[PDB]
Design a protein around this motif. Structure first.
Motif, PDB file in Angstrom:
ATOM      1  N   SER A 133     126.061   7.860 154.420  1.00  0.00           N
ATOM      2  CA  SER A 133     126.807   6.956 154.367  1.00  0.00           C
ATOM      3  C   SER A 133     128.144   7.230 154.206  1.00  0.00           C
ATOM      4  O   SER A 133     128.387   7.930 153.288  1.00  0.00           O
ATOM      5  CB  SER A 133     126.358   5.928 153.523  1.00  0.00           C
ATOM      6  OG  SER A 133     127.513   4.473 153.685  1.00  0.00           O
ATOM      7  N   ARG A 134     129.064   6.847 154.551  1.00  0.00           N
ATOM      8  CA  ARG A 134     130.663   6.847 154.626  1.00  0.00           C
ATOM      9  C   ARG A 134     131.063   6.141 153.052  1.00  0.00           C
ATOM     10  O   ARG A 134     131.605   6.225 151.775  1.00  0.00           O
ATOM     11  CB  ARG A 134     131.569   6.043 154.917  1.00  0.00           C
ATOM     12  CG  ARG A 134     131.317   5.837 156.357  1.00  0.00           C
ATOM     13  CD  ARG A 134     132.013   5.159 157.565  1.00  0.00           C
ATOM     14  NE  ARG A 134     132.292   3.273 157.058  1.00  0.00           N
ATOM     15  CZ  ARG A 134     132.798   2.824 157.337  1.00  0.00           C
ATOM     16  NH1 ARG A 134     134.755   3.221 157.216  1.00  0.00           N
ATOM     17  NH2 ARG A 134     132.643   1.842 156.908  1.00  0.00           N
ATOM     18  N   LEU A 135     129.549   5.069 152.533  1.00  0.00           N
ATOM     19  CA  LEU A 135     129.668   4.294 151.284  1.00  0.00           C
ATOM     20  C   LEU A 135     129.180   5.077 150.041  1.00  0.00           C
ATOM     21  O   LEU A 135     129.183   4.245 148.790  1.00  0.00           O
ATOM     22  CB  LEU A 135     129.058   2.889 152.160  1.00  0.00           C
ATOM     23  CG  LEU A 135     129.118   2.374 152.847  1.00  0.00           C
ATOM     24  CD1 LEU A 135     130.005   2.775 153.947  1.00  0.00           C
ATOM     25  CD2 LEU A 135     128.489   1.423 153.507  1.00  0.00           C
TER      26      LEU A 135
ATOM     27  N   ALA B  71     130.405   0.495 148.164  1.00  0.00           N
ATOM     28  CA  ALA B  71     129.922  -1.043 149.743  1.00  0.00           C
ATOM     29  C   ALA B  71     128.550  -0.537 149.062  1.00  0.00           C
ATOM     30  O   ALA B  71     127.980   0.354 149.653  1.00  0.00           O
ATOM     31  CB  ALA B  71     130.197  -1.460 150.400  1.00  0.00           C
ATOM     32  N   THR B  72     127.329  -1.304 148.982  1.00  0.00           N
ATOM     33  CA  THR B  72     125.439  -1.278 148.944  1.00  0.00           C
ATOM     34  C   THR B  72     125.662  -2.538 148.580  1.00  0.00           C
ATOM     35  O   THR B  72     125.805  -3.818 148.465  1.00  0.00           O
ATOM     36  CB  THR B  72     125.272  -0.076 148.291  1.00  0.00           C
ATOM     37  OG1 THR B  72     123.986  -0.027 148.764  1.00  0.00           O
ATOM     38  CG2 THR B  72     125.306  -0.899 146.749  1.00  0.00           C
TER      39      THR B  72
ATOM     40  N   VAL C 279     123.413  -3.849 155.304  1.00  0.00           N
ATOM     41  CA  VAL C 279     123.888  -2.121 154.722  1.00  0.00           C
ATOM     42  C   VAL C 279     124.393  -1.753 155.541  1.00  0.00           C
ATOM     43  O   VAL C 279     125.620  -1.043 155.762  1.00  0.00           O
ATOM     44  CB  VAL C 279     123.337  -1.064 154.169  1.00  0.00           C
ATOM     45  CG1 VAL C 279     121.596  -0.681 154.846  1.00  0.00           C
ATOM     46  CG2 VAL C 279     123.513   0.317 153.857  1.00  0.00           C
TER      47      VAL C 279
ATOM     48  N   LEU D  64     128.064  -3.049 157.193  1.00  0.00           N
ATOM     49  CA  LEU D  64     129.447  -2.340 156.192  1.00  0.00           C
ATOM     50  C   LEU D  64     129.261  -1.069 156.716  1.00  0.00           C
ATOM     51  O   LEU D  64     130.432  -0.951 156.782  1.00  0.00           O
ATOM     52  CB  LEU D  64     128.898  -2.140 154.192  1.00  0.00           C
ATOM     53  CG  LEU D  64     129.267  -3.709 153.881  1.00  0.00           C
ATOM     54  CD1 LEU D  64     129.505  -4.110 154.103  1.00  0.00           C
ATOM     55  CD2 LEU D  64     127.821  -4.664 154.033  1.00  0.00           C
ATOM     56  N   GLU D  65     128.103  -0.339 157.071  1.00  0.00           N
ATOM     57  CA  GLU D  65     128.783   0.843 157.489  1.00  0.00           C
ATOM     58  C   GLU D  65     129.127   1.030 158.404  1.00  0.00           C
ATOM     59  O   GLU D  65     130.260   1.475 158.155  1.00  0.00           O
ATOM     60  CB  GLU D  65     126.755   1.598 157.766  1.00  0.00           C
ATOM     61  CG  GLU D  65     126.611   2.727 158.547  1.00  0.00           C
ATOM     62  CD  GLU D  65     127.348   3.509 156.969  1.00  0.00           C
ATOM     63  OE1 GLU D  65     128.343   4.078 156.983  1.00  0.00           O
ATOM     64  OE2 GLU D  65     125.852   4.837 156.462  1.00  0.00           O
TER      65      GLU D  65
END
Lengths: 237, 237, 237, 237, 237, 237, 237
Positions: A60-62, B166-167, B177, B180-181
């Motif tokens: 993930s980019r997260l 972020a998660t 998720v 957001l992803e």
């Protein structure tokens, strides 16, 4: 404490302590499996130092990029990289860290690194026979330069330990290991060494083409460890 | 003082600490299941702080509303939200709280929050291998601003810990998720960040239309945490 | 549905500390069953205090009436009523009792009652994961007025705790809880509160017509607990 | 750690400790299996000393050669060579080492080596009966010259110990032992002794032709142990 | 698909500390059985004291008569009688004895007898949940006069305790308890009280006609216990 | 149902501390088996002393002859010979040795040898009941002359101890014990006594003709133990 | 792989400390069996003392006669005879010996012998419920004269104790007990008492005709124990 035992024992424990009729510890075997399912990494002695390189495969980019460091420092002159059950790996590293400090504070200096690896190995070995407790599902390799010179050791869930000229671990071990086994050049200077390495790493796990961003660190006799910055590794990439 | 436990058999028997033939801790897996069935919550770093938001799904008129606080404070600058077996979550929270206090009293300041989570993580990792004792059936995320800045971490029953941008966690993790992803905006200013969040939380669990009353709090570098009041949250709702 | 056992020696002897493949603690579940078969009781916040009411269902003439007190004081300002395994309840209650004293003798005052219950809760939660020991099969509710105001909390064998506006426990929980869920009046003055209560209690367990003799106690902000006398309760009966 | 603890109740754990109806400890049997699968090594008294020799079978070019020392020094006058689970072997050896030092610091001198081996063997014997713990899967032989003169002893996973005129252990035991059993020459002078040995070693494991590089060390009454250097061994090879 | 190995039922572990899928402690149940197979005895409050009576069923001429005292004194003002496993009963009785002395030595007087029994009960309760240890297969009833006045309680393997106007224990419990349940007279003067009792006892166990020689003792407010002499008992017989 | 019992056939054992439905300790029995498979040895009181004799059956030329002593001294005036698990024998022997010294240091003299054996016997008896531990797989005989006079005792894995006029142990126990049982001569003079013994020993184990080289030692009231030299024994051989 | 009369599921009591569905301790039951298979012995109070008598059944001529004393002293005024697992019996006897000294050393005199037996009984009773430990497979009877007068008690593996006028134990218990049960004469003078005894013992075990050599000891109020000499008993024989 009339007996005065060197090693204390909280409890005898139950389970995990049975030889198969063929003389094997199956649990230790299953433990090894989990490590096979871990990320791939390797290390190799070169010119006048040793380098560590691990495949930093991200999703993930997260994810907070760098924060997922696989190559860890035990001390300015000794780093280790691990593969297997993450939690287990961490806890094992910290043990190695303090253990390192211990020798330092008593003798005043970590003269031989082999000894450090031996101590964390023994830790692992105990869970191999002491009944009620699950073995550490992880393998790791220690590298750095000690009083003797540049050193590269590996260690499996069994607590087995060996010294190499070059080696790898994790998912693509058999693969990358073969590559080095064939094209590993003895006293390869750093730049070239990191090349051969990254090429080796690539070939191996690169069934899926993209090498992504490898995490690499190197130390040379005489000074402290050097971690490669994003661009520098991308240069070899 | 001390409990004075002279001698007792609190831990014993056999049934866990067994790796499966494929290298997996089934118990820890079963545990993960319990957390999926937990409520949904998420968080993300934004402008110059980080925010936390949990879905406060209520039932009876007879419950004491706010008293069912899901976002809990560890200290004025760090909060955490949890998902899984409620009891397990509570006890694991308090541990972090005192553990936090401990670092404060020795060093004079909780400089790195990452460390706080690591301690609580290790606690959980222990029950992953020490024979006679059931693992912590819970996952949680810590958020706050430390010496390094705004930080976001999550932790599972396995003791695995990671830092995010972020998660989410709980029931609708996969869903929220992914949103957001996709639509996560790097340096989104608070107002817009809370929005994106609440929107993301909605989509996910909102198979059942009504978002109900979400619980949201945030902190920004330079100051203490701020818990959003009923009306303020209802404003974004 | 064996995971992969082959050892003839192993085949049973499992201890209490196993998550089901679905993420559940069956033992804690079976415990709950025991409390379902317990007597029925409830309590609700009212005007400026809170009351407690339980169904005192008696059998033989030969029992020492009152001696079978279901509503027990932990201290002049806080009580608890319980249901499930009698022995476990008792001992659990005595624990709360001493626990209450401790806070008093250290801080000089039991400022927040919520905390007292959290402790006894934590006690219970310990048995939920610490190997060799049977969970407490009892659920109980604490109520009384503290520094914050009139309070009401319930606790189940899993150590779960929550605050209510009104609630019940034991056999007729679902029934009585529904009645309030519908007819519960917010700031209902005592006399009427006890009425709504006894009514609710009635409907529920009163599948068997006769309400018999209920045990009722109430405390209002400013002063100590009051236990209703046989005649006084009969008045509402 | 912080809390004091009192050692008591020696009994603890439950698993391996069952005689078969035919009066056999199967676990210890299985253990023995593990040692059969280990590398082959032997030792024999000669003219005025004794010598040790082990088959150092190497794989990759990537292994750090010598570092995989099989013959290990316990002290300048007594060595040992091992076979079986490599980790178990190591920990056992170190025990032997600290133990040897212990006698030296109390008595001022390790007068009888037989005793040393007696202590390590008793170590192993304990795991043969003390409930919850897996036996050491290894067999080793101690050799060196003591107050009595040159001495040679072997030790198996059962804790059994015996003194030989010559013997071996590991994979090709049966084979090598037989060769000696037949052509072993009483007071053979070192040069011919090492020959008779390497030949005996060859024949045995030498189903696979190449003897590879053997590891050989020898001591003679009056002085300290000597390890043969690569060229010297290659000379007998 | 989905996992459904355990719909709601689970296998019961051999270890003592498992709730049945119905919320019951089977081991405690089995214990109760052992008590039913014991001798029959009872007690009841009367005029201004309380009396105890047990069926002293004798076999051989070779027994030392009286020496088989079933009614035992805990202190001049409190006695108890027991039924079930004899050994378990005795140990249990002495605990109560010493326990009584302790109260006496610290407070200076045994003010409330209910507490004494509570202590002995909790003892048993412990063995209801603390793993490796078989529950006390015994039930007993304490009787005597304390600061409050005449008192009578009973206690079972589960540690459950109640106070009665009258009650019995042992084999013919159900029978004799019914008799009293019907013909029990509130403030019955001693002489008649002992009669009603002996009649009740008779009826019960007297399926086998002969009541034999009953063991009876009684204490009244104001003084110490009085055990009836052979002749005196035979008078009511 | 009731009185439920499993299959009568026993094969897969587990815990060690379980009487069979017939009143026997299967583990201790199995233990005995191990001793039956041990060497054969005997002893008998004679004229004014006692003698011990064991069949020293040797295999390979490579063994260090005498070093395989079967008759071991506990103190200059008391020796013992053992049979069964070699490892268990040794450790047990050493226990007796220090155990002997202990009495000497406290009372100043080992007055009664019967006592020495009882202590080593109790050690054994302990493992017959204390749960998690495998019983000692050995039997031995103690003989020598104490304050009372010449003595002879035997001890089995169960911890059973008896004094004899003459007896044997090991493989051919039954045989040799029978020969004596018939041809044993009360106050036989040493030279003849050793003859009767060797003869008796011969017959028994001598199904295989060759008696090989027996190990024999004898002590006479008034002085210390005498171990027969190769030639001396060969003389009777 | 389990023991049982094959009737239904559920282990009889392999895990020790498990009540059977009918309320019985199978392990304690099996223990009783072993005592049945022991030698036969008895005792009875007489004129002004008490006497003990056991059947000393001997085998080989090689046994050291008298040395196999079945009647053992605890102190000059109290002796006991046992039956069952010899080893267990012994350790059990020594316990009572030291236990006696204890009372003498604290109070200055063993006033009530009943107490002594009770202590040895409770010791036994403990193994009846403390999990991991095999119960004592033995029963014994204590006889002697104390402050109250001549006393006789018996005690089984369950820890059950009773005082008798006369009784027996071991193999032919039921048999000899009946004889007494019928022909026992209250204040029979010693000479005749021993007679009635020997006759009784005879009848019982004497299905095999020869009574062999009985071991007999007696004490009379006012003085110390008297063990009968070979000839004296042979006079009654």
């Amino acid at each position: 404490g009339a007996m005065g035992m060197q090693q204390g024992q909280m409890a005898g424990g139950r389970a995990i302590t049975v030889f198969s009729p063929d003389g094997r510890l199956f649990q230790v075997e299953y433990a090894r499996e989990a490590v096979k399912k871990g990320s791939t990494a390797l290390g190799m002695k070169f010119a006048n130092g040793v380098l560590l390189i691990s495949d930093k495969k991200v999703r993930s980019r997260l994810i907070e990029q760098n924060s997922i460091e696989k190559i860890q420092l035990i001390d300015d002159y000794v780093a280790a990289v691990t593969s297997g059950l993450v939690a287990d790996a961490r806890v094992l590293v910290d043990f190695a860290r303090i253990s390192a400090q211990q020798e330092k504070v008593t003798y005043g200096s970590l003269v031989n690194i082999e000894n450090l690896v031996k101590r964390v190995a023994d830790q692992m070995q105990q869970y191999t026979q002491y009944g009620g407790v699950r073995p550490y599902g992880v393998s790791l390799i220690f590298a750095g330069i000690d009083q003797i010179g540049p050193r590269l050791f590996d260690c499996d869930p069994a607590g087995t330990i060996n010294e190499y000229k070059a080696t790898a671990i994790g998912s693509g071990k058999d693969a990358v290991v073969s590559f080095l086994e064939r094209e590993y050049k003895e006293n390869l200077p750093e730049k070239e060494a990191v090349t051969l390495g990254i090429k080796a790493l690539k070939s191996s796990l690169e069934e899926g083409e993209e090498l992504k961003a490898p995490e690499i660190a190197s130390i040379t006799v005489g000074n402290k460890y050097r971690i490669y910055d994003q661009e520098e590794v991308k240069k070899f990439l």
